[PDB]
């Protein structure tokens, strides 16, 4: 289970205050005759720092656009896209990328991620059904009481958020609209003429976040890459800043919106947004002061220290692994793990982590120190919890047996089932670190429990043989079945829907309407573990294989991989030389490798986009309602740009967690006062 956004942001606001910063947007000039002067976007950035490459986690834009604050939900795909276009426009105006805009829509994710998504969506669906019952019973009572409920405003037509998933018709709309949007930008403001646009849509496998990071790694590795590229990533995942550190590009910041019975049901009666920067370079400064250990028998390496810090944070729980029972970020687990790491490091032989690999002997050192403390941790927690005015009883002797029997259904008679649980968790830890640093090591691997073993049980780790079966990303329709609850059936091809709803479906057991949520530390149901069955992948694959031959050719095409696209202006410096080499008589079918002066700092392989017909007239794929939006999102009669299928380069080598040569470090921000505070706190 993930730590969450409020949790990491509170840790950042508490210990790393200077990393968070308000985004400055240049104002519109408003003249007394209603003339409005939009700021010139080619001018310097009011934030002082210029951006080269802007990367967008597009689904982190679609979601907020689906439930706005003072502008209730859009209902139509067309309405949705106008909102998305406007939100994106705002980001482009505040960020002002000079070299690249990378738009990443989530493609099929690895099984480990799919399981987190399955749990979340099952819980959201359960939450929404429980709300719907309560709301309708409230409305019935209000009718009989003579209270005039505004039923149109109360019964809100909510955007089906489950359509924001690879393989749905809306994903085709999103892709087509964003293709247009790119072509628009390339044929409008002159400031986007020198900007290259990449679209990585939902038919390209991988989380949007990770496709961005994998792109960064693929470019870093090229000798002619600019070692002082300024990166800005927009995304909402709590993960994002961890990925930013993992990148080892110091010129890096995250863009995000500033996080800092009648009410909950949305009852309405007839008679009744700033953004923030998260500066990863400033985070690196903090961690240098935080993680430096004197008199080591091996060289101190900030890059190695940062990686360790990214790794031991996995213990507090993320998308792919449950938190260890004794570790909670709210209870200062990150600070506790940092102190254990600092104390262990001099005698440990080296760093926990090596370019995405885990030293299991060293992991055991960290975990043993946690395991020695947990008896007391569970006692302290209960002691503090009683200062406010279950069956496991962690604060009470014998809890090991009760926890494993109640949560894992392991009797004290079966000690090898605990060992199998820790083996699985260890695999998980290695899976996540390789995922962050080298790429997904297994598209099928998952942690097959809802709870973690105690840290005390992480003994003899070095003897565990960690291996992964890479396999392949699941087909879009397989991910949908691996992720959706039965109530979201509408998002699948009609012939595949029956697998979730029909009593006689081979795999009906994967889709129960009713399931238990275990509180495991009483709070509320959102602070809980959903006890869902884990899908048997073979059974799911065999079930779809019988129905696949009955899908239309279009449904089948929607189940296959598509391409990443590169859009460049005809006025771009690279254009004329790229076209000469591309339409050259060496071969017009073989991909063109971007190299020499021609590449202009972008690397990979390009080929022609065959789907595009050489008619320069391009129209908007969706309808627009307002007169101002029809003006800014209209037809493009002369498309002065080309689109190309684009493939990132792939290194034959392990990517190293090191700074590039030529790296010129951003100005130091932490004052005597800042460094003082960090010293005393640790």
């Amino acid at each position: 289970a993930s730590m969450g956004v409020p949790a990491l942001f509170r840790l950042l606001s508490r210990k790393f205050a200077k990393v968070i910063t308000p985004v400055i947007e240049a104002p519109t000039e408003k003249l007394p005759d209603g003339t409005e002067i939009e700021p010139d976007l080619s001018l310097p950035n009011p934030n002082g720092v210029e951006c080269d490459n802007l990367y967008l986690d597009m689904n982190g834009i679609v979601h907020p656009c689906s439930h706005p604050e003072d502008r209730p939900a859009p209902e139509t795909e067309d309405e949705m896209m106008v909102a998305v276009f406007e939100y994106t426009d705002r980001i482009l105006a505040m960020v002002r990328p000079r070299q690249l805009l990378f738009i990443a829509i989530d493609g099929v994710a690895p099984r480990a991620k799919m399981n987190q998504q399955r749990s979340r969506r099952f819980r959201s669906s359960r939450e929404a059904a429980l709300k719907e019952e309560e709301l309708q019973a409230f409305i019935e009572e209000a009718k009989q009481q003579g209270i005039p409920i505004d039923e149109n405003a109360t019964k809100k037509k909510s955007w089906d958020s489950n359509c924001i998933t690879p393989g749905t018709p809306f994903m085709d709309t999103l892709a087509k609209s964003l293709r247009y949007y790119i072509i628009n930008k390339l044929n409008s403001d002159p400031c986007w003429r020198n900007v290259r646009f990449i679209l990585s849509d939902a038919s390209v496998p991988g989380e949007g976040e990770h496709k961005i990071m994998e792109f960064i790694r693929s470019q870093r590795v090229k000798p002619e890459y600019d070692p002082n590229t300024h990166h800005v990533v927009y995304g909402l995942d709590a993960d994002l800043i961890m990925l930013g550190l993992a990148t080892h590009e110091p010129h890096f910041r995250v863009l995000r919106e500033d996080v800092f019975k009648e009410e909950r049901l949305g009852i309405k009666r007839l008679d009744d947004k700033p953004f923030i920067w998260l500066n990863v370079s400033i985070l690196r400064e903090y961690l240098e002061v935080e993680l430096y250990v004197p008199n080591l028998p091996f060289p101190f390496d900030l890059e190695r220290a940062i990686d360790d810090w990214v790794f031991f944070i996995f213990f507090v729980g993320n998308d792919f692994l449950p938190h260890l029972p004794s570790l909670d970020i709210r209870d200062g687990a990150v600070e506790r793990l940092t102190e254990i790491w600092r104390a262990s490091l001099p005698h440990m032989g080296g760093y926990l982590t090596l370019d995405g690999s885990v030293n299991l002997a060293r992991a055991e050192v960290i975990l043993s120190a946690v395991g020695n403390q947990e008896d007391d941790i569970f006692k302290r927690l209960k002691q503090q919890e009683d200062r406010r005015n279950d069956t496991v009883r962690l604060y009470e002797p014998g809890y090991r047996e009760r926890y494993y029997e109640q949560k894992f259904h392991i009797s004290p008679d079966e000690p090898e089932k605990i060992r199998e649980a820790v083996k699985h968790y260890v695999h998980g830890l290695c899976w996540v670190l390789l995922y962050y640093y080298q790429g997904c090591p297994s598209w099928t691997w998952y942690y097959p429990y809802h709870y973690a073993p105690f840290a005390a049980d992480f003994k003899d780790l070095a003897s565990i043989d960690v291996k992964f079966e890479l396999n392949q990303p699941f087909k879009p329709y397989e991910q949908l079945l691996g992720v959706l609850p039965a109530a979201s059936k509408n998002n699948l091809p009609e012939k595949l829907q029956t697998l979730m709803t029909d009593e006689n479906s081979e795999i009906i057991d994967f889709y129960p309407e009713n399931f238990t949520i275990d509180l495991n530390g009483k709070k509320f149901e959102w602070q809980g573990v959903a006890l869902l069955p884990f899908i048997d992948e073979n059974r799911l694959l065999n079930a779809v294989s019988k129905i696949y031959p009955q899908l239309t050719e279009e449904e089948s095409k929607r189940n296959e991989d598509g391409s990443t696209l590169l859009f460049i202006s005809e006025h771009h410096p690279m254009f004329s030389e790229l076209v000469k080499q591309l339409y050259s008589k060496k071969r017009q079918g073989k991909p063109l490798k971007l190299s020499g002066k021609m590449a202009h700092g972008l690397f990979g392989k390009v080929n022609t986009n065959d789907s595009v017909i050489p008619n320069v007239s391009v129209q908007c794929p969706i309808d627009v309602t307002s007169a101002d939006a029809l003006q800014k999102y209209g037809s493009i009669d002369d498309n002065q740009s080309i689109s190309l299928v684009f493939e990132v380069p792939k290194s034959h080598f392990v990517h190293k967690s090191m700074l590039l040569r030529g790296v010129k470090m951003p100005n130091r921000v932490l004052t005597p006062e800042d460094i003082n505070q960090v010293r005393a706190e640790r």
């Binding site: 002619e224 080598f653 990517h655 190293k656 090191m658 040569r661």
Partner: protein, 332 residues
């Protein structure tokens, strides 16, 4: 005959036109002091950690460099094996032009070269034959600091193609300055066409496919840090500029060290940035990049015109032993 050329007697003139140094050939040298016609010894820039002790390995892991000067026939032989025609006025080592060019800056640094016009091609070939004054300090601790800095700042392959052990174990490598990569260049200075050969410390990124590679090349220097108000520092930077300018080297990276040989700071410069950077700190009567070029062009034309008044295969000696004059002697 004996002829003298005064650095002072040169009138104010426009800076001579200087062409972009074009690489026509390259080669590698090994530790056994043999030559190979390939990119074998080409290296890539990757920095060491700061506070690196540049003494490490002196002298136990130190392969002292050759002390006798290389005959210029070496370069003539390379070019002819490759079937490259020599249609220029001078063939020499880049370092020998630097010495002529920078002589006015260094009255203490004495030197002598031998000059012969080839009867077949008409090219004037220049070399040293006697062990140079500078080479006598070849294996001093402070010279080692420079060789050490080069060893811990370069890689055999691009960064990504190197293991992290390869990078992190560089402090434990033998320091072998005889192992080098070299570039042979055509460069025009005024009416003089020169073919020059010199060591290339490493490359910034990689050698372009065939684009001229020299702007991708890097020179590595070690020095004590002083402000630009310090004349000694300006003079050193001017001499750094002159050397790299002559082979069209794009970047100079200086490892600034303290008195005990510890690397405290590194500074990246574009070669062509140096003149502008020094400009504000120049006072009247100072040697500037342009004045050094004017006086060099005049020196080269004076040598050419003198040598051409005599039969081919006449040996000449060019000496600087301090003062404001170069001395050119015909050997009988």
């Amino acid at each position: 005959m004996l002829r003298e050329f005064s650095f002072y007697d040169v009138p104010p003139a426009h800076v001579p036109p200087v062409s972009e140094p074009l690489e026509i050939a390259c080669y590698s040298l090994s530790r056994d002091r043999e030559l190979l016609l390939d990119d074998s010894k080409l290296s890539y820039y990757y920095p060491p950690p700061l506070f690196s002790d540049l003494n490490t390995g002196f002298p136990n892991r130190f392969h002292p460099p050759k002390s006798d000067p290389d005959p210029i026939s070496i370069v003539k032989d390379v070019l002819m094996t490759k079937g490259i025609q020599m249609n220029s006025s001078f063939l020499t080592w880049r370092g020998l032009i630097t010495k002529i060019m920078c002589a006015p800056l260094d009255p203490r640094n004495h030197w002598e070269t031998y000059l012969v016009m080839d009867p077949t091609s008409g090219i004037i070939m220049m070399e040293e034959r006697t062990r140079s004054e500078t080479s006598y300090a070849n294996q001093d601790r402070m010279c080692y600091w420079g060789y050490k800095f080069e060893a811990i700042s370069t890689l055999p392959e691009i960064w990504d193609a190197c293991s992290r052990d390869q990078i992190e174990q560089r402090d434990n490598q033998d320091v072998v300055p005889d192992e080098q990569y070299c570039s042979i260049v055509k460069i025009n200075i005024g009416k003089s066409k020169l073919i020059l050969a010199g060591e290339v410390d490493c490359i910034w990124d990689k050698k372009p496919c065939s684009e001229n590679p020299n702007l991708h090349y890097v020179e590595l220097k070690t020095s004590k840090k002083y402000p630009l108000e310090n004349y000694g520092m300006r003079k050193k930077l001017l001499k750094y500029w002159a050397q790299s300018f002559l082979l069209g080297i794009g970047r100079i990276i200086i490892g600034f060290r303290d008195d005990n040989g510890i690397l405290i700071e590194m500074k990246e410069l574009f070669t062509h940035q140096i003149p502008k950077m020094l400009r504000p700190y120049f006072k009247p009567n100072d040697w500037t990049p342009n004045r050094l070029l004017v006086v060099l062009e005049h020196a080269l034309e004076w040598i050419k015109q003198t040598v051409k008044q005599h039969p081919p295969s006449t040996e000449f000696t060019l000496s600087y032993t301090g003062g404001s004059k170069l001395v050119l002697r015909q050997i009988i």
